[PDB]
Design a protein around this ligand. Structure first.
Ligand SMILES: OC[C@H]1O[C@H](O)[C@@H](O)[C@@H](O)[C@@H]1O
Ligand SMILES: [Ca+2]
Ligand SMILES: [Ca+2]
Ligand SMILES: [Ca+2]
Ligand SMILES: [Ca+2]
Ligand SMILES: [Mn+2]
Ligand SMILES: [Mn+2]
Ligand SMILES: [Mn+2]
Lengths: 231, 231, 229, 233
């Protein structure tokens, strides 16, 4: 029953539910089946950066994911978020593992949202063990090497399967308003995805939800902690 | 029992509880009896600005209150907030009326905090009828002309006695941390205090509190919605 | 070499303006690559907001007044192919046979590349504003405002004026190795006339770091263009 | 002569001109002889961060310098900049070497200044310095681009630092640092740096400075004078 808009960094192609047949970034409007995707050369054990932008003038959600010294992956999609989301939302990071797995480690996260001005800005370049400005859901924890581990990792530092977790910014965010002339947001995060396997799964997403969003039961694996099913 | 740090814009001298005998600005560290005050030439019905700053290097809380084309009032007090406040806090605006009254209208409020870097910034230049990133307490309301009315005003614009209200930012703020090299915050608000009669009361404060802080029982009047008694 | 967003108050149909006040995106020519109709409000304070990023490669602008519907215009353009890597940014305005005040009450700009950034904000302009280059008739400090074109002691705008203000620091507007490049500008303006016939308009622009007012660019050319091609 | 206000990270103790006998950070108001200093445990080859703050309410120039996992050094001095500097300035980083030497490598530099009277502001941030960085004025031996860093003083192709070098980098736009009619004025600066040396007592240091707009390196200002002062008065 939640409403979700997300940008997904999908490490595991589930072609049975529409993923293209490679690792990819996508834009998800109310479904795990991305409205748009682009090919992504995920680099195991390397630190990448994701950058998500939107404004109400162009009505265009874009994302760029990059690693140092590599060509970046970019995806864009036309959508007026006033038609999808409620006026007030929470914003968050989600990740999952399944039969296959990976660390879903978040090293930094920033966000800015403006409504013309009213503004909200936060930045985490370090997460503490007791991060009262985050709502941690599922298996997500903070504080180990000052990072946000969205899914379960053991002490020896090895990722566990079938895990799901999220972190939402505590304050509601006014993401759109009819009376506003311009609304915009941007989000940045740095992430470290490492697998012992060879086959990493399942991904990390930046998402925007109704304020009371919770992890749907069963949303491990291909469902990214975002959706109750694959419709 | 709440922990409070506040900067008060005190319109009504209660000489019997240690107010000086003129309107004043004050720094309150866990007591309504200001640790330092300065004379404040309040201007009934004009828009004022208050600016509050602190950093962990100087460990000095200062405040400056001004009106266009008038001399500003400044107060400062040396205090190590590390030994006063909890590590995580909420920030807020509070006001009250008693036997005597006034409007306690907030036209704008911004805050920035930094911990080295993690950061939180917000800015309100307009308040809406349903401002979900604020916790309104007591008599506080939003949406009347796009402003925050901290105390009761009638439909005819006139302020009411025996009122108390507060507005806190929804997200906790990490105000200090021992591992941190430098911590700083600042806050700015613009306010409009009108009274029909001579003699307005009781005042406006910017405050910092334990996360779960609430209006103390009985704290209309002299206690500014901050303190349970006049100790 | 000019990219600009014009707030065109005077229809010059002679050279391809539409028959109504318009906003437009100008890429190297006063003949806008895209326009939109604009219900300019004579003597009210307006706001212009301009945005571009290198992911979308879309230059967009919105102009509005309180309690009025806004005007918006966009144009796809890759600034990598139109501007040098380093530029200056500014505001320009003109009058000719008709006239208007071209008063700037505020101006802010942010640019970002990858992370390198520049931000500035003027809400008040001073008599001797050393981080601006004033060109032509532009002056600062009267009531704390920037007057891009001539105004008399009592406030009457003068015909045949041109003036501009550029931020003193060069701006790094694109770099081929950047992941994301972006800018935004916002200004608030007061364009007033003693009749209808107000002219000629205000523009936010991006040029070469040595750009000066081209010769004979009063009027229709908004202080931006050497000819009407 | 130029008017200079500076926060110095002084690696070399020139006790004959008033340095304490240890590496130190200090506040310099028109003289290389600091108004105030604190001991600084400089760490050869580690990346350090410096943070400089000032506001016109408290009128106290403070600085904190630090390294990961070490205690930071801090220094503060009460001084009203309105009395010392002209109203418009440029801001800069300077460094020098002498008989002894060190890399004076700047990896990042950010600055913000604000004035009220509803505010004017200027912010810049460099996390990368490019070969041809037109919003910087480079003076003396200073160069940009090598590994995207700003090298204030001369380093050989094999990365070894040279003695007797001086260089500076100033932001191109003038800064409105104070104004008569301002309710509050403030600035902060942050930079990260790498000082590596072969020698046992590295020299001479790095400084964040604020100067007249037309400031240039004074004659004879290598070594202990940090590219900032014509002499040791
Ligand atoms: O983990 C990879 C893959 O494994 C299984 O098939 C499920 O858990 C999917 O939901 C997931 O995509
Ligand atoms: Ca998948
Ligand atoms: Ca009182
Ligand atoms: Ca025209
Ligand atoms: Ca020395
Ligand atoms: Mn997918
Ligand atoms: Mn009092
Ligand atoms: Mn010294």
């Amino acid at each position: 029953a939640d409403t979700i808009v997300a940008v997904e960094l999908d490490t595991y192609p589930n072609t049975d539910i529409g993923d293209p047949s490679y690792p990819h970034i996508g834009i998800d409007i109310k479904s795990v089946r991305s409205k748009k995707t682009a090919k992504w050369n995920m680099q195991n054990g390397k630190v990448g950066t994701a950058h998500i932008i939107y404004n109400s003038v162009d009505k265009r959600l874009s994302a760029v994911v990059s690693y140092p010294n590599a060509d970046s992956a970019t995806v864009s999609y036309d959508v007026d978020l006033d038609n999808v989301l409620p006026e007030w939302v929470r914003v968050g990071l989600s990740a999952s593992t399944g039969l296959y797995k990976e660390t879903n480690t978040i090293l930094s996260w920033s966000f800015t949202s403006k409504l013309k001005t009213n503004a909200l800005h936060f930045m985490f370049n370090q997460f503490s063990k007791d991060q009262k400005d985050l709502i941690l859901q599922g298996d997500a924890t903070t504080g180990t090497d000052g990072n946000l581990e969205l899914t379960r990792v053991s002490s020896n530092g090895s990722p566990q399967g079938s895990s799901v977790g999220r972190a939402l910014f505590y304050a509601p965010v006014h993401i759109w308003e009819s009376s506003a002339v311009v609304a915009s947001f941007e989000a940045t995060f740095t992430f470290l995805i490492k697998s012992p396997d060879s086959h990493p799964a399942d991904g990390i997403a930046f998402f925007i939800s109704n304020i009371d969003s919770s992890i749907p039961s069963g949303s491990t694996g291909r469902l990214l902690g975002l959706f109750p099913d694959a419709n």
